């Protein structure tokens, strides 16, 4: 099938440059143009530019001076680069493909790349268990989770049992602490009878800091 | 550029009902408008192209109409899976532009939260910080009160809340309240209590524990 896979999220300093790679499959870059769209809290969805199948590029006028898009047809990769980033350039960046080679109706999207523009440093999270107990077990249902604390920047992916456990899972939106670091909890409800036989592990991946942690959560 | 205005900002309906989204343009753009859906943590999903033309893989309940400056996206029978934001896009003029979006919320029957409390881990205490987590699980509506008391002393300012987006399956919310204090302070107190107030509760629910 048609897929667009983007490079991971990360931190970019003010006045520095941003680079994102878009690897595509299910079609050839010699047949289709690839567009770049961003989504920010201030300006919402914003079309940035496009690299056409022939090699020609168009940039939205406010970005023409600091945008450049390249590609390697053989490697099926498209390269996005934007100079002199400022704080309101903090956004999710998408690469996308249209239905036809010339049009602008975006039928296929990349997973997005959250780019944060700050002067701070990247920091991995510590992961602490939220142990199930009587204080969290009612009607045969036990609750347990993981505390993902003190990281920067967003995002952090949390899964349970390597993806095998999805129902009952709640990964709360991160909150910004006074320290300027994010913190969140991910919880899941399970049968209390499975606490003795099933292992429960939250899989934490903070891509910006390359921090991967598997945390086993047990009753205390 | 072409300014697209989406109205209204928020939209709250009940399952099975029909709902319409409005997208108005600053000047005529013919039928050159596309619609998108954005679910939680997702990328946009093309729903309708060119005002009314349908898209493969998109449920029949999604339709569109309009020409000139007034356009309408419709869902004839809303499901819980439809909880998302909806954006319009014009491409009659360069560069292509998007509207600000409309948030679709769903109504459901009142559901009282299940309340669980988590004392800080011994692992976290090794760092010199204590986090007490109070979980309010699967409730509707969103409004809820969480009161923290440590040794009968009302806590204020030292806790943070986070609320999930609406669940696509049962349309509920979950809430976390995290009381954070130093290891020193945590060891100087005994009773930690979390008191929950919600419409679905005939009485406030208190979850608590004694340190040690």
């Amino acid at each position: 099938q048609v897929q667009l896979k983007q490079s991971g999220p990360g931190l970019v300093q003010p006045s520095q440059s941003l680079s994102i790679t878009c690897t595509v499959s299910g079609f050839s870059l010699t047949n289709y143009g690839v567009h770049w769209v961003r989504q920010s809290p201030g300006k919402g969805l914003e079309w940035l530019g496009v690299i056409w199948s022939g090699g020609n590029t168009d940039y939205n006028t406010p970005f023409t001076s600091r945008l450049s898009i390249n590609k390697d047809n053989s490697k099926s990769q498209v390269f996005f680069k934007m100079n002199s980033l400022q704080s309101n350039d903090t956004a999710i960046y998408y690469c996308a493909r249209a239905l036809t080679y010339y049009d602008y109706e975006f039928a296929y999207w990349g997973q997005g790349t959250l780019v944060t523009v700050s002067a701070a440093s990247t920091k991995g999270p510590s992961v602490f268990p939220l142990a199930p107990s009587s204080k969290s077990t009612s009607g045969g249902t036990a609750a347990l989770g993981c505390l993902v604390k003190d990281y920067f920047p967003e995002p952090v992916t949390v899964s349970w049992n390597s993806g095998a456990l999805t129902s009952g899972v709640h990964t709360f939106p991160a909150v910004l602490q006074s320290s300027g670091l994010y913190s969140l909890s991910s919880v899941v409800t399970v049968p209390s009878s499975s606490l003795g036989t099933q292992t429960y592990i939250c899989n934490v991946n903070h891509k910006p800091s390359n921090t991967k942690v598997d945390k086993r959560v047990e009753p205390k | 550029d072409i300014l697209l205005t989406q109205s209204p900002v928020i939209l709250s309906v009940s399952p099975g009902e029909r709902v319409s989204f409005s997208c108005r343009a600053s000047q005529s753009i013919g039928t050159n408008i596309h619609w998108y859906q954005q679910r939680t943590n997702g990328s946009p999903r093309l729903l309708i192209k060119y005002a009314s033309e349908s898209i493969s893989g998109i449920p029949s309940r999604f339709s569109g109409s309009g020409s000139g400056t007034d356009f309408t996206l419709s869902i004839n029978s809303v499901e819980s899976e439809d909880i998302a934001d909806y954006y319009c896009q014009q491409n009659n003029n360069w560069p292509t532009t998007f509207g600000a979006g409309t948030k679709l919320e769903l109504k459901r029957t009142v559901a009282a939260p299940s309340v669980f409390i988590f004392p800080p881990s011994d692992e976290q205490l090794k760092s010199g910080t204590a986090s007490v987590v109070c979980l309010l699980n699967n409730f509707y509506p969103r409004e809820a009160k969480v009161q923290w008391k440590v040794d009968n002393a009302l806590q204020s300012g030292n806790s943070q809340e986070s609320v999930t987006e609406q669940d696509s399956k049962d349309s509920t919310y979950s809430l976390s309240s995290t009381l954070t204090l130093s290891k020193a302070d945590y060891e100087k107190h005994k009773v930690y209590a979390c008191e929950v107030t919600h419409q679905g509760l005939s009485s406030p629910v208190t979850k608590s524990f004694n340190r040690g």
């Binding site: 920010s40 809290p41 919402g44 | 954005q38 939680t40």
Partner: peptide
């Protein structure tokens, strides 16, 4: 409304 980078949803 304001777009939330964390949840990819609108926060009103």
């Amino acid at each position: 409304x304001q777009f939330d980078l964390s949840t990819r949803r609108l926060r009103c």
